[model samples]
Target: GEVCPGMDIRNNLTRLHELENCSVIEGHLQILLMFKTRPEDFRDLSFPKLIMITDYLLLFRVYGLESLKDLFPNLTVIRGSRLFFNYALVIFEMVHLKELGLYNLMNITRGSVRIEKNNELCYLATIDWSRILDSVEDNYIVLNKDNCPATVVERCWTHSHCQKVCPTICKSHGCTAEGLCCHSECLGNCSQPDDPTKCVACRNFYLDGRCVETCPPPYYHFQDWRCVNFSFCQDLHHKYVIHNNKCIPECPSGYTMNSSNLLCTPCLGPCPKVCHLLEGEKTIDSVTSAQELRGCTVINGSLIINIRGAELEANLGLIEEISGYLKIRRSYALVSLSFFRKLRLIRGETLEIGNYSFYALDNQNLRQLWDWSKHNLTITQGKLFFHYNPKLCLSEIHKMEEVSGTKGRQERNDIAQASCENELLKFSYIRTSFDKILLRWEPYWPPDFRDLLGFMLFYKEAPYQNVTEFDGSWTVVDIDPPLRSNDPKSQNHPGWLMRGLKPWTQYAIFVKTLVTFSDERRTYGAKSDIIYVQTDATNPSVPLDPISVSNSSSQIILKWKPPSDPNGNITHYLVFWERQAEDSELFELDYCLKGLKLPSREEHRPFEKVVNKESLVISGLRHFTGYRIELQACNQDTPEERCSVAAYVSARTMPEAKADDIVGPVTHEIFENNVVHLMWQEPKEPNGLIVLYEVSYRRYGDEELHLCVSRKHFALERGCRLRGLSPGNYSVRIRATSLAGNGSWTEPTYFYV
Candidate 1:
């Protein structure tokens, strides 16, 4: 209420009391916040004679006025008239003000009092407003700072000293003047004695009466935790859906829902299973380990694994099919393909994964891949992306045709680079037995463990004693890992046993690539070294051991031991008498061995011979001719299309005996230490070329090497030097062994030591 302007609240103490004569406000009476105003400032403010307020009274944001129990001692009624629609005593944003003096304030006419946001002003119920006033109007009591209702100890006005006694903590609102508590937003109307906390009309997201922290479903959320009506809830949950009016996480723009929860529901897109392996809503799991993918054998969509975490799985087993893209990127520690042995297919034709089924990027340490289902590599509807794995040696991969020459193979880069990690894997030849040989190799381990297609065992039985014999006849058998095994072989030195091998025969064994998965559907790892192995024995049907060549002189004879393991009754022998293979000739038995294309047709047929006998003597053959014979044991039941593994041996035919014309008046000299020079007359017309003159010499102390000289020397006439002789007591025997034949040795001729 306004006092006379001429009155100094303290100085004109008497003039201030003059308003007590007959108090009745006209329009409005406002007692606004007085900076630093204290209780004593109102000590002289007496309204003993005041009766009614015509409109309203506003005591707002007044700083620190403790007691108003002395003012308006006779304030009786508030008759609402001219104000903002309605009138009442409005107390707002007051700090630290308690005792109220509305002692005689009894009734209101169509008007009510509203108190809000006052700190430490509990006194919510002690006001005894219902006791004095006839009827109450709408209560606007909101967040307040009252302790609740303070029971009467004594009235502040009548007691000589007002004692401070209630708790200052207001659970929800504020402390009131009458020593009671109310909500921090509640005003005077919350003065109900029984439930001092009883709310009247809520200020925000209104419920039945009071303001609440959170709203129930179906209600629009007006503010943070404040519920409201539907229309306003676009107040945003996905902010504007179903309009049921709750604020949840907002749905994407095109979404609406009746549920009070805000986030949009049920994402609608073309390929629902497409997973974008970022750190977001798409990943069903963290993709940290392969265990997370166990449940999916054939994914209906693509799966991308892009992780920064160091932990990852060593194997991926379940997946065999994919209907979408599969991209792997940014793995900090992933190394080689040690898993996914059974995965054989990539069945994708979707988008976002890529036009190809698989993709990979930035797996820094990734080295090799395993054997995978090659057929699926051709089915990708998208372009395959295999790049950035600096250790992945692309050229060495096996079965690359599946992805190569395909219409869509993306920018493949970094996969084939200069790095130690990008070298061909090598294996150890463990052992070889009668029918099988063991190969031990450790699967490529990368910077960290990774999944793969599995390993491929490649082996062949060829007399390729040479390592680089990859040519026209190398038959390579590529065996993939068995799908159901946790092969104990993988624990350390992974060993593979190649069966059905030929014994005493050398074989060129190799392990090239794997059929495991790469970024795309399925890819291969690099090829391994060609490990050579030979079996001690074989399924002995074909025989060519301890073979005897009668002589290149007479009809050349080739005799061999009968095969031990004659499968079925060995009907007859197949003696392959061809112009024997030359020692200088190296054949490309397995040119372009496997993958990408089927083995090319063998257009080079060296020679062939079949005789139904254990031993064969060829009567007609050029003298001094060399030939390799391959014998295969066959039977009547042995279909013509099939013959037992063959046994091979090489021999040369002999010419006439060197004794044809032995007129050897041999002459010799030892000029250079152990060098012996000799001359001999032999051979009729020289059976062929006089290759060597048998000038046999032995140390009298139990001799060893027979001294021989080839006609390349002998001055062509007949003399030659047989050098490097370690001498003691020595004797010389003379004979002439030419390329055509060898003449008989004469008696020993005495020689000086």
Candidate 2:
């Protein structure tokens, strides 16, 4: 009679071995918390003769061992001497179990089965529950893998010697057609002939494996479809709530009811599960409009604060986030957004106007955003815009922008171009050139600007001397901050070089520093005091070409306009002229003999005439000669005039042929072998005495002309001979030169040898 105390096989292999020879357990059999148990310890070891557990059997948190077929090969019954939570057999938290290997287990003679939280246990459907126990509906089997195949049939018994065979048509409990022998406590059917433990369901309610007329002592009064304790319902109060007369987790599908109150009433429209998560956009236009959002922590749509007064300021104290955008506009009374103290994240799930997640504009009286020092808010997506906030300080907006990582992207704001504090942006400009200016400004301290983005330099060319009174168009340039490197080379005060400006031009300059909350949103300070800058003088541009026309043979007139860009005041126009050489090759020869004993031809002095007006005239002695005239613009003369590039004009004195025509025809004597003697008579009507004779000849029908000069011998015999000429047909012409100029030549006369 190997009877033993209840077994709890948890700690040692010896505990399990102690039951190897035991035939029965007097109390419950529990194998729990065997985390380190080895599978080899139970592989070949079992109580071969142990067939019964007087109380319940529970297997919880057991590891390493798989199938329990060999462990309980001969175990047949789990009696209901005592139950574990109304369960005769319990299998819980066995992650490695694939099947309940109670191969020879015949009956749970007392309580119900509770197979829960077994992640991998299956084969519950393969059990012949009617053969083991009289009933099967009381089993609580959940949270386990449900699987069974038709091939696994364990319970088998031979049909031997029956006094009466069972009827074909019968209920699940028994063959009820023969007799109505079910117990009075049973609801529908019974398992055994007269057993309360075998009822399909209790008439009043069910307890530990039995039907009862009323709940036992210590069990609180309760009513439900199933007989469960009120203590279990209270333990899972969050999951299973009391709704009127029933324990339910939710209302009918698509119906709404108050979650906290549990009234279970249907809603006309789609309603939220709780007020903590609100849907749709919110517009706070009045004090009462904001009351509905008092307890909300998150909003799924955009929020617009367009109120007129401060009465609704404290209504949004508990909001922490908005999935959509937040816009504060048309509010003339609000000074700041500090009421949203607990706000941390703006999800920007929806944008305003397809682009901006946050837009605050046209608020004439707002001073700043919320206090950035205490609450570090985040804009998760979309752009921000702050415009027309005339009194709002840019420093607050910029601080918020930097902390939110929304830099570089900003919409243009209409706040002042400088800072809120006018004295902080004091800056001065130094003229760097005739077309450039260098500007330096006092740097902001850490207290003044903690997270500064950069400075913006604004300037424009204005005619007025007063910086503030100018109405010129503006130009802006972004100036980034210097790096804080340890190399000791970075500058302290920021400066910028504005080049490509007009020389000696007056300009009104100012600077403003700004910051961005996002890449597309920014705020700026008021512009600094307008500083006037006028660049210094430099060389002027080249003057226009001198429009000169020769009026006389020995004198010429010239006129020119001023230079296009007169960078300085114009004093006078300096005009100059030089006689051109007849032989152009002399210039190359002069270049070849440069720095030699003979001075270069470029050393020829040009005639100069300084004119107060834009015109000039010169009188020279040379006749029938070309002269090059140059005009220069100047502004000074004592320290040497600052001249511009010369404006040039090419003019020739009146031709000497305008005086008279030669009055004789040329004649030539043709000799042998390409030699010819050319003769001509003197002019009969000369205005002055002829000092020289010119004989010009060329090949007939050709433009090549040859000249021969001879002193005037006699008036009747003024002639010269041309020899060594090409053997071709020739033509000869002669002209006479007087003191005034040269006269026209005779008509051509052709001759050839």
- What C-alpha lDDT does candidate 1 achieve relative to the native structure? 0.51
Tens-place lDDT digits, model 1, residues 530-583: 666666632336675637475656466767767666534456665565554323
Give residue 249's lDDT in candidate 1 (0 to 100): 45
Q: Write model 2 residue lDDT over 17-105, tens digit each, in one string.
A: 77766866768888888877766665556677775676788887777667666577666556655888878888888787766675555
- Could you say which candidate leads in lDDT? 2
**TM-score per candidate:** 0.24, 0.33
Worst 10 residues of 2 by lDDT: 156-165
What is candidate 2's CA lDDT for residue 660?
A: 45
All models: lDDT? 0.51, 0.62
